[PDB]
Design a binder for this molecule. Sequence first.
Ligand SMILES: O=c1ccn([C@@H]2O[C@H](COP(=O)(O)OP(=O)(O)O[C@H]3O[C@H](CO)[C@@H](O)[C@H](O)[C@H]3F)[C@@H](O)[C@H]2O)c(=O)[nH]1
Ligand SMILES: COc1cc(/C=C/c2ccc(O)cc2)cc(OC)c1
Length: 440
Amino acid sequence: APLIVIVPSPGMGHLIPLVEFAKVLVSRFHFSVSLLLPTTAQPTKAQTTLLNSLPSSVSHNFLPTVDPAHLPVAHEVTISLTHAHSLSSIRAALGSLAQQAQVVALITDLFGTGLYTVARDLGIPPYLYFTSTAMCLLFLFHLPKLDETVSCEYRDMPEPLVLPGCVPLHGKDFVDPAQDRQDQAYHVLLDHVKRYVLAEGIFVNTFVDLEPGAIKTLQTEDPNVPPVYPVGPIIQSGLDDDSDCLKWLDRQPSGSVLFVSFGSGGTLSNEQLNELAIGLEISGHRFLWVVRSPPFGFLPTGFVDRIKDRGLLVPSWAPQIKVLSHGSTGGFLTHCGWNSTLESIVNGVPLIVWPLYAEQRMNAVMLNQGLKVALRPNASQRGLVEADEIARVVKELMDGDEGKKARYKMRELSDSAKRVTSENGESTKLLSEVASKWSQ
Ligand SMILES: O=c1ccn([C@@H]2O[C@H](COP(=O)(O)OP(=O)(O)O[C@H]3O[C@H](CO)[C@@H](O)[C@H](O)[C@H]3F)[C@@H](O)[C@H]2O)c(=O)[nH]1
Ligand SMILES: COc1cc(/C=C/c2ccc(O)cc2)cc(OC)c1
C-alpha cells in the first residue's frame, strides 16, 4: 500500500483538519498515512488521545522537540520557526520512510512550505492542504503585489480591496498577521506565500457552489499559481465521548435554539461574557451556550436561575456536530473559524458572526456581505458588544425576516454541500482524480 506523509504545523487547529484529511484518504483509497509532528513541547494528553484513536492505517511519530533556546510573538512566528528548526528531523524521517516504503506524496498546511524543495529533490510531489476559504488563499496569492502597491498600514487604506469574484474587503478585516507590517509575523507570512508556487497542487476545504468567484480566479487569472482542487467540505463525523446537551435539545421546539460557542482559542473578557449573558436573557430566545472561564460563579447575579426555563449553560466543551445537526438548533453564534462554519453550512444553520483572530474577520465579511447567511452585531467604539445589540441580532436571526432570508440561503448551501460530497459529487470525483495519479 503506497504511503502519504502528512506534516501538520503544531497546534490543534492545524492538526485536526489534516488528521480528518488523513482519515478521508485511508477510508476512500488504498493508502497508508504517516503523520510526522514537529513539537515545541512533549506530547499533550489532547494530542495523544486524538492520535492513538486513529485507524491502524495512520501511523504517527512525534519528532524530537525543538530546543526552546533556538527561538529568538504571533503563532505564525512560533509555527514557522518550529518547521525551520525541525527540517533536519523531517528530512531524516522522510529519508528512512522513502527507503522502507513507496512515499507517493507529502502534504503540509500553509506553514509547511519549507519542505517543498526538499520533497522535490527526493522525488516526492508536495501538496498544500488549505484549511480556510478560496477567498483567503486568493488574498494570500495577492498579498505580495498588495505589499508593493499599498505603503500605509492596511487599516488606513480607506478604499476596500476588491479581488476578482469576491466581496469587497476593508483593510481592518485583512488576516491578523497583516495588521502590523513591522511585526515578524507579516514578513514570515510573505515568505510562506511566495513558496505556494512550489506545490504540485493546493487542496482547499471548500466547494465551487460556495466560492465560485474566488475558485474561477485561482484557477485562471495566473499560470504561475499551481492547480487548485476544491475537495470540501471535510468535517469530523462527531461520534464520540459526551453531556446533558442532546437530552436538553430533545425538549425544545424545532429551530428555536441559538447555539453559542467560540473556539478553545477564542477568549472573551468577564465583561464581554456578562454582556452576552444579559443579552441572551433579554432576547427571550432559547440557547445552548458553551461558557469558557474568562463553574459559572462569575456570571451575572440571578442569571443562571432566571434562564433555566429556556437556556442551558455547558462548561468548556459540547458535541458541536451533534448540536448543529439537531432539529432544535436554528442558529449559531460563532467566531467564524472555517471548520465551525463548514459544520454549520452542511447542517443548514444560519449564523451570527463574531470574529476574534486569524482570518475570521474576512470569513465574517464573506458570510455576512457575500453569501448573506450571517448577521453581525455592532461593537461600541471601545470594542465591547452591548447586551442590547446582542438581543437585537439574536431576535433578528431567530424570529426576524433577515433570519428567514439567511436560513433559506444557508439551507441552499446545505443541499449543494450534500450534492458535491455524494458518490458522484464534484468534490468526491476531483479528490479521487488527483489520488489515482498517486496509486500508480
Ligand atoms: O465546544 C466545542 C468546540 C469546538 N468543537 C470542534 O472543534 C473544531 C473547531 O473548529 P474551528 O474551525 O471552529 O476552530 P480551529 O480549528 O481552531 O480554527 C482555526 O483553524 C481554521 C482552519 O485552519 C481557521 O479557518 C480558523 O480561522 C482558525 F481559528 C470543530 O471540529 C468543532 O466541531 C467541538 O466539538 N466542541
Ligand atoms: C494568517 O492567516 C491564516 C492563519 C491561520 C491560523 C490558524 C491558527 C489555528 C490554530 C492555532 O492554534 C493558531 C492559529 C489559518 C489560516 O487559514 C488556514 C490563515
